[PDB]
Amino acid sequence: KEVVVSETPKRIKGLEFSALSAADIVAQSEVEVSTRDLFDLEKDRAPKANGALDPKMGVSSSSLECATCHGNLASCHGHFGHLKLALPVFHIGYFKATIQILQGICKNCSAILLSETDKRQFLHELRRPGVDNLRRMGILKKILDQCKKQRRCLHCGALNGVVKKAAALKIIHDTFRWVGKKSAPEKDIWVGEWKEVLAHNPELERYVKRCMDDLNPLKTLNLFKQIKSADCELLGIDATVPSGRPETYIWRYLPAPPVCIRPSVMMQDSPASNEDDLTVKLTEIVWTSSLIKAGLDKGISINNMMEHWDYLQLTVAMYINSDSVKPIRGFCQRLKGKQGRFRGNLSGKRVDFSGRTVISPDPNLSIDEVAVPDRVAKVLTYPEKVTRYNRHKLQELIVNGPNVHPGANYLLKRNEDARRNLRYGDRMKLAKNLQIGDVVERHLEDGDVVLFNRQPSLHRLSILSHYAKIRPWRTFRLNECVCTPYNADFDGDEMNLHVPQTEEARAEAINLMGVKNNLLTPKSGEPIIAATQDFITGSYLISHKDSFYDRATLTQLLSMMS
Amino acid sequence: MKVLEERNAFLSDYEVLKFLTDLEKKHLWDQKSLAALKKSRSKGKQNRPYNHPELQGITRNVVNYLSINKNFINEKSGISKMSDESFAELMTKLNSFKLFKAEKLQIVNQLPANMVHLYSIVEECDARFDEKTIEEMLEIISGYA
Amino acid sequence: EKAIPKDQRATTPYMTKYERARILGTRALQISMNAPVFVDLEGETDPLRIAMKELAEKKIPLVIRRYLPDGSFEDWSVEELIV
Amino acid sequence: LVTPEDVMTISSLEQRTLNPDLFLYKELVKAHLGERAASVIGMLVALGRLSVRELVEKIDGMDVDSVKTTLVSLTQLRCVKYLQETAISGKKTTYYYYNEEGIHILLYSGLIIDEIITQMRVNDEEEHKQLVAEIVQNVISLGSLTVEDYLSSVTSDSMKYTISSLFVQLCEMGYLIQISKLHYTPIEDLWQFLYEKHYKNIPRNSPLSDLKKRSQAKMNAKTDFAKIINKPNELSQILTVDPKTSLRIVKPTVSLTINLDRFMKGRRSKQLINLAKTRVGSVTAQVYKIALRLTEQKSPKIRDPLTQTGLLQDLEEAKSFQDEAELVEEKTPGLTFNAIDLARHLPAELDLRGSLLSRKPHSASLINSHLKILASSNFPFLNETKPGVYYVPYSKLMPVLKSSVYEYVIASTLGPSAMRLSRCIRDNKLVSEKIINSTALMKEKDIRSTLASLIRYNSVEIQEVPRTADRSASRAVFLFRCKETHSYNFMRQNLEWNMANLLFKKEKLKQENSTLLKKANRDDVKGRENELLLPSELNQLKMVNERELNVFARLSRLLSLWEVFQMA
Amino acid sequence: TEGRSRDGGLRLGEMERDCVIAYGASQLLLERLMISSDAFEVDVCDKCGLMGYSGWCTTCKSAENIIKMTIPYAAKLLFQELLSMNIAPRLRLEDIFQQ
Amino acid sequence: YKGEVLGITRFGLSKMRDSVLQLASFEKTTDHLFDAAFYMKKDAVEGVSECIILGQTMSIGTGSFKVVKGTNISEKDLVPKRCLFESLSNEAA
Amino acid sequence: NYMSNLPFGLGYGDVGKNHITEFPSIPLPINGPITNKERSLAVKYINFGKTVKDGPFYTGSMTNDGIERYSDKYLKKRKIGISIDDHPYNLNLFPNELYNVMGI
Amino acid sequence: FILSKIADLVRIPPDQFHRDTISAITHQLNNKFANKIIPNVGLCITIYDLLTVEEGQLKPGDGSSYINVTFRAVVFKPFLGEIVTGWISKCTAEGIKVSLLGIFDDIFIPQNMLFEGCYYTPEESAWIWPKLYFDVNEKIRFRIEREVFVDVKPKSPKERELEERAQEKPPAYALLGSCQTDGMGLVSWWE
Ligand SMILES: [Mg+2]
Ligand SMILES: [Zn+2]
Ligand SMILES: [Zn+2]
Ligand SMILES: [Zn+2]
C-alpha cells in the first residue's frame, strides 16, 4: 500500500464564466428541496429532509451536523441543493441575452437570420489573435444588427421583425412589422384564421389589435432546444463544452444556495429562530412550483394557471435582483452597493490585529516612531515563531504571561492545532518546554513594525509604517513633524493602527512605507515631513539675529537638542 | 511527480546489494539504532532534526532477503564476498555465452546447480541447445558457490 | 522561459527598493523558520534585524529573478546587486 | 426519495442537455469509426466551417499527421465536405464541412442491405442474394468501391463476370452513382460560385439597371446550377462504352459510390404502401404495393432540388419555387402512366377480379378503376390531367402526409381526448376557450388536463390577449393557435435524441462487455460458442446478446419514424 | 465584526488598499486583506474549477483533481452566490513553480 | 493609448481590460457579471483588483520579480554512477 | 402570504410534495415483439460496423517491454494491418493536403 | 530491481538549508518515496542518485526552497521471466497467500495456473497429488505473467465516515505466479 500522494502548489490563472446546465446543477447538488415547509410542529421545529433549510445543504449554527460533510458551522463549506421547476421560466439576468439571441434566429424554423456565406468573413475575422473586449462587442453588435435587418430567413422566410419586450416581463415579436400592400399565403392563412375568430365573437373586433407573436419562456425554451450547434459561435456562445447550449440559459433548475450563504439567525425577537429573505423567497418559489406541478395532473384553469406562472417570473425576478415594484434584498442587492459584496468585502474589509484611539503629540518620539498604549499593546500581538536565536526571550515572555506587558497571550505548539491561552496552565512549564517551531503570540514591543493610518486616506502617505514605542497613557502619540502627511491636528482626531502579522508583510511595511523612506510626497518630490508651527517658531526665535548665548546656555541648549 | 520513463537501466543483483550496504554504512546503521540515547539530538525532532522511518525497514528487508543464502539448495550469506574484480574477471564467459536476452539478472542471484533452473530462466532452452552447452554455465555461475 | 546569460544583462545593476524589501522579508521569514544565519548577531533575536545585518554584510544567499515583459528573465545575485 | 447521486447515473439527466444533431452524429461516428474521428466530426458540428489548423487548436489531438489520417478516413467515409478557398493576397488553404447525408450510409446500412435484398426481382436464389448482400456491405464499408480493385480481387473469372453484370443494373437503378466534386461541397458555396461569375460577366454601361441585371444573373445561375446538378444525379456515361466481342462494361477506372436518394425513394414508397396496408384492405392494398413501384425509380426530389437549401427562398413573389415544383411534377411525362403500362408489371399472384363491386386477368379496365379510386380518395394519392393517364403529385400530398404522421404520433403518445383536442386545434383554425366547448362537447376537465400534458411539446401555440395597452395574460382571457412548423421541428429533436440514446446504450453496454465481446468475435470461437466457454460466462454472453438484439430491434422500429419528418 | 462594542476590527477600505498598492507592498496587501481578515482553505478541482469539500469534487465525484489553496472567504462566498444564480465562475489553476 | 480618447467612466473602462471582477468592483457589478456569463468570457487574473479579490500576489512592486535560492550543486555529483550491468547486457548482443 | 392563492379545482393534498418522477414515463409502442426479419436485421447490423472496425478504418487508437523474450523470437506476428496509405484511393476526390499521407 | 527516472518538485525547509543540498533533496525524496508504491509504476525502495537539480525557487509566502529535481530510483519490477524465493505466510482455499519478509505480501497466485492436481479441502489437508507436496511457511518458486495495477479509488467522505464509524484491494501493485514447469514451488524437490 502507502501509494505515493503528490501535492504541487498552484494559483488561480483565470476565470471561465458560464452558466450551469441542468446536468451541472444536479451534479453539484447533494439533495433536492421539494417541500415548501422548513419546520413542522410534529418534529418540534427540527430541520429535516427536503425542506428549505434541509441540513444536507448546511447548518446555521456551530452546534449542528450537516449530514453531507458532518461538519459544524466552522468546518462546513456549504452544500448546494437543486429544485425542479415544471414549465420553466425566463432568466432575469439573461433577459437581454435572450432578447438578442431570439433576434439572431427565426422563430419559425429555429434557423439563424444570417446567410450561410455572408457573415463568415466576419466570423473568420473573429479569430484575429489580437481581439479586445471592444472588438468582441463591436463584431457581435454588427452581427446582431445585420440579422435585425435580415427579415426573411433562408430556411423559412417569415419576416422576423422586432423582438422587444412587453409594454410585465413578457416578450412580443412583430411577425408582420414590414408588411404593406402585399399579399402572401401566410397573409391569406392569417386572414382566414382571424375571420374564423371574428365570425364567433361580438366584441373581439377591438381586441384583435396588437396580439402579435408572444414569446413565453416555455415557447422560447422549446425553440432554443431546436438550435443546431453550427450557429452557436455566431450567437457568441461557444458550444465546445457542455452547458454552451442556449437552452441552459432558461430557468429550469434552481440551485438553492447552501445554508451558509443565507444564514438563519438564532433567538431573534420570538424565541424561535428567524430565517432570511432568500430562504423565504425560495420557499415561496418551491410552493408555486408544487402548485403548478399539481395543476398538470388535474387540469386547472389555464388563465388561472397563467396567473401563477406569471408570478413565478415575478418572484424569481426579485429573488435574483429586486428591480420590479421595495425592501426585498435580492442576490444582486447583496453584490451591489457601498456595503454590498464587492466594494464592502472583496477589495476592502475589516482586519484583525488593529486598534484605534485618540492621537496626542509627542516631540520626544522619533519621527519614525509611534507611541502605543501599554493597554492596547497587551492585546495586540505579533506571532513570533521560536527559533534558535530567540528561544530564551520567548521563554521570558511566556513566564511573564498575558498580564504584564513584556509578555505573551497565546502559545501555538509546533505539533498541535489549537493555540494555548496563557491565562491558565502554569506558563513556567510551557516556557520550559518551548520548542523550535512553536509560535508565541507576544505583546507589541518596542520597535515592532506597525501601520498607522488616518481617514480619509487621500494619498499614500495617509498610511505610514512606524516603530512601536510602548507608553503608559491611552493615546496613539506621534511626533508633530509627521502630522502633515496624516493631516492630523490633535483635537479628538482618531487614527488606526495595524500590526502586520507575517515577516514578509512586516519587512515590506517598514521598508516601503516607513516614515524615514517617505519624507517626500510622490506627487512632486517636495518634502512633506518637516517642521510644524511651534517647531518653526522656536527655530526662528533661536536663529533670530538678536539671539546670543553664553557657554552655559549654549551647552544646555545642545543637551536639550540631543 | 510525472515519471519520465518507466524502464530505465537494469540492476545487477550485486549492484543493489552494495548500494544498500553503502546506504547503511553512510547512515541509518542498524547496530547503532538498537542502541539507546537518552539525550538524543536535543534539537526537538530527533538527531539534528531528522529521522528515518519507513526507510530503514525497506532498506533492511531487501538486504536481509539477499543476506539469506541463495536457494541453490535447502554457508555464505551468498552475495557478501564477490568483489568488483571478481565479477569483472567473468566477462570471458558471461559475454561469450550467447542468450540474445537480458535475463542475466536471474542467474546472477538465484538458481544455480540445477539444469531445470536455467531451463526456466531461458525458455525453450533444450530446443535451442541440449547437446553440451548446459553444464559449464552451471559450473561457472556456481563458481562463487 | 529562456534565461539571459550572465555575461549580458539589460536590466539595472542596482537593487530596487521593492527588491530590497522583498529580499529582507524573505530572508527574515527563512530565519524565523530557523534558517542558519551567516552574521554575528551580537544578541539580536529579531529575524528582520538579523536579515538587515546580513544585507549590510552582503551575505544574504538569495538571487533576484527579474522577468522581462517578453517572458524571459535574468538572475541577479543579492551580492552583485549594488545599493 | 431519489438521491442526486442515484439520478444522472440511472436517470440519464446529463444526456438530456445534449443537442440531438451533435449527439447522434458523434455517437454514430464513435461507435463505427473511432474516438478521434468522432471528436473531429463533433467539433465540425459544433463549428460548421473550420480548417485542419482549427482542429489542431480546438481538439486535444494536435499532431498534424494523426489529424490528417483521421480526417482522410472521415472523408473516405463520405462524412466530410471540403472546399479550397483562395485569398488572392497570399497563400490559400482549404476548409472542411461535414457531410450530413453521408453518415446515413452508416446509419441506414442494415436497412440499405435489407432493401437491396428485398427489392430485387430475382431473390429466390440463395447464392445471388448472399453475393449481392456482400457486395453492398463492401461498398458501404469502403465508401467508393472500384471494379478495378474488385475484379482483380475475385479469383474465378465467371464469378468476376457476374460482378460486372450486377453493376450496370445497380447504376441504372440509382443505387450506384458516379461520385464527384458535387458530393463534397456545400450547396450555398456552389451557389455563390455560380452567382458571382455571372455578375462579373456583365459588360459595363448596359441600358438595364441593378434590379433586372440581378434578375437575369440569378436566372442564368439557376439554369446552370440545374444543368450541373442534373448531369450526374442520373447518368449512364460510365456504363455506356461497350468493347468489341464483349458484354457491356462500366468504366473500371472510376469509383463507384453507393447512392442514397433512390434508396430513400424506395423507403418512402415502402412507408406509403404500409400506410395503405393500414388504411385499406389487402385486396387493393396489395395492388397499391406495386403501383408506386413503377414510379419510384424515377420519382422526383423528396424535399429540395438543392436549389432551395443553397439560397434564400424568396421575399416578394415567393410562390415561384412551389409553382415550378408542381409545374415540373405535371410536365414530366415519364412519371405519368396508363393502365396499359401497369398491366405489364403486375405479378401473377394478384388476380384483381373480386376487387371491385360495380353496384351496391390483368384487365386494363380494372387497374384503371383502382387508379380512379386512388385519385378520388380523400388523400390526394394521384391526379388526373387527361382521361386515363394519372400521376403522383407532391405539391399538396406532403403537408397532409406530414400532418397525418405527426398527428398519429401525438395520438400514440397521449390519450384519446388528447388526439381529439389536437384534431380540433388542427381542423379548427384559432380555437378559443369557448370554441373548444362548441366544437368538442367532451369533458372540460380531461380536455384541459390533456391540453396541459400537450403544452409541454411544440404542439399548440399559446397567445396573450391584452385588454389594455400593457400586455398581461392574467388580466384578460387568451386564445390558441396552430403554428404547425414548431410541431414538425419537435419531431426532429426528440426522435434524433432518442436514436442517439439507443446508440449510447449500445456503445455503453459494449464498453462494459468489451472483454466478453472480444472473446466472442474470434474466428475459431465463431460457430463454436457452446463448447470452449464457462457456464456462467456463456449465460452472460447469451443474455447480453439477446439484449443487444433487442436494442437493434427497437432501433430498427424507430428508424421508420424520422425519415418522414426529414422531408420539407 | 463592525463595532467597538462587539470588539470589531478596523476596516481597511478601498482608499487604504489603493495607498498600499501605490507603495508596492504586495505581501502586506495579502497579509492585511486575506491572512488577517478572511483566509479560507478551499478545495478546488483542477478539471472543473468548482469548489469542493473534504477534498471531494462532488461534481466530478473523483477527488483526483482536487487541490488545496487559500482564498478570501469573501471570494468563497461570492463564488457560491454566483453559483446561486446561473453564473459558474470556474477557477483555472496553474503551478506557481516549474518556471 | 487605445487610439481614441477613452474616459474614466464605466463605458470608458470597458476599453480592453475584460476583467469582469475589476469592472464589478468598480461599478455595475451584476450586468457585467451576467454579460460575462452569457458570452462565456475567460478573463485571466492579472489585475491588482482581481489579485486582491482572489487573494493572489499582485505583480507590482515586491511582486514584480521572483526570489530564487541557488542550490550550489556541482556537476560532478549529478552524473549517473555505479552502472555496468546495462553495458554488459548491451555488449552481450 | 402566497399561501391563500389556490384555484377552486385544485386541492391541498396534491401540492407540497413536488419532486416529480425521476424519469418521465410513457411506455413507447416501438418495442414490440421480435420477428425473424427483425432478428436478421439485428444480425446484419452486428456484422456491419464490425466490418469497418476489422477493416483499416479505425483512426481511434491513442507487453511493451524493452526486452524481447525468446518466446517472442520466432513467434507469430499479431497481424499486418493494412495501412491507410496502403489502400488504393482516387486522387481527385481527395484534397491536396490529404495527398502526402497516401503512398503515391 | 530496475531503475526508473522521475521528475519531481521537492520542498527544502529553511531548517535544512545548512545540510548539503544533495543530502537535503535526497532526504525529502526518501520521505516521499521511502516504502511507497508509485501508481502503475511499481514499488519504491529508495532513490539511487540525482541528475537535474534546478535552482530552488520561493513562493512569496513560504520561505522554503522548492527544487525541480529529476532522479533515478530503484523500483522492484519483475516482468515475465523472473524467479523469486517467496516465503508463504497464509493459506486460504482460493490460492495460497505467498508472502515476503515484510516487503510486500498481498500478491496472490491462483491454483488454475498453478499445478493442476493441487486441490484445497475444507478439512485443512495440505495437498493431494497423483506424489509430493508442501506445508506452509516454507520456500517457494513461481513466475510473473501479468501485472494489474489497482488504481481505482472513488471514495465519498460520507461513506468513509460510515466506514470509520463501523471500524477491498489494499495494494496498488501486486504479482501473480505459476508453477507450470517442474521444479518450481520448492528448491529441494530432489538432490
Ligand atoms: Mg482634527
Ligand atoms: Zn456540510
Ligand atoms: Zn427561418
Ligand atoms: Zn471537478
Numbering used by the authors:
A (entry chain A): 2 to 168, 175 to 332, 348 to 584
B (entry chain D): 1 to 74, 91 to 161
C (entry chain F): 71 to 153
D (entry chain O): 25 to 384, 447 to 654
E (entry chain B): 1051 to 1149
F (entry chain A): 1364 to 1456
G (entry chain Q): 14 to 75, 101 to 142
H (entry chain G): 2 to 131, 137 to 173, 189 to 212
Can I see the authors' text?
Maps in the presence of IN1 reveal a piece of elongated density at a crevice on the surface of subunit AC40, located between a hairpin-loop (residues 108–130) and the C-terminal helix of this subunit. We unambiguously assigned the elongated density from maps in the presence of IN1 to an IN1 segment (residues 609–625) proximal to its C-terminus. This segment contains the tethering motif of IN1 involved in Ty1 integration targeting (residues 617–622), previously identified through mutational analysis and referred to as targeting domain of Ty1 (TD1). In the structures of Pol III bound to IN1, TD1 adopts an extended conformation that includes a helical turn along the AC40 crevice and forms an intricate network of interactions with this subunit. Residues W614, M619 and L622 in IN1 establish hydrophobic contacts with P76, F315, I320 and the aliphatic chain of K316 in AC40. Additionally, R620 and S621 in IN1 establish one hydrogen bond (H-bond) each with D111 and T114 in AC40, respectively. Importantly, K617 in IN1 appears as a central residue coordinating three salt bridges with D109, D111 and E312 in AC40. The interaction between Pol III and TD1 is reinforced by contacts with subunit AC19, where residues T136 and K140 in this subunit establish an H-bond and a salt bridge with W614 and D612 in IN1, respectively. Our maps in the presence of IN1 showed no density for the rest of IN1, including functional domains for Ty1 integration that locate at the N-terminal half of the protein (NTD and CCD).
The yeast Ty1 retrotransposon integrates upstream of genes transcribed by RNA polymerase III (Pol III). Pol III transcribes short genes encoding for untranslated RNAs such as transfer RNAs (tRNA), the 5S ribosomal RNA (rRNA) and the U6 spliceosomal RNA. Pol III is composed of 17 subunits that are organized into four architectural units. We report cryo-EM structures of Pol III in complex with IN1, revealing a 16-residue segment at the IN1 C-terminus that contacts Pol III subunits AC40 and AC19, an interaction that we validate by in vivo mutational analysis.
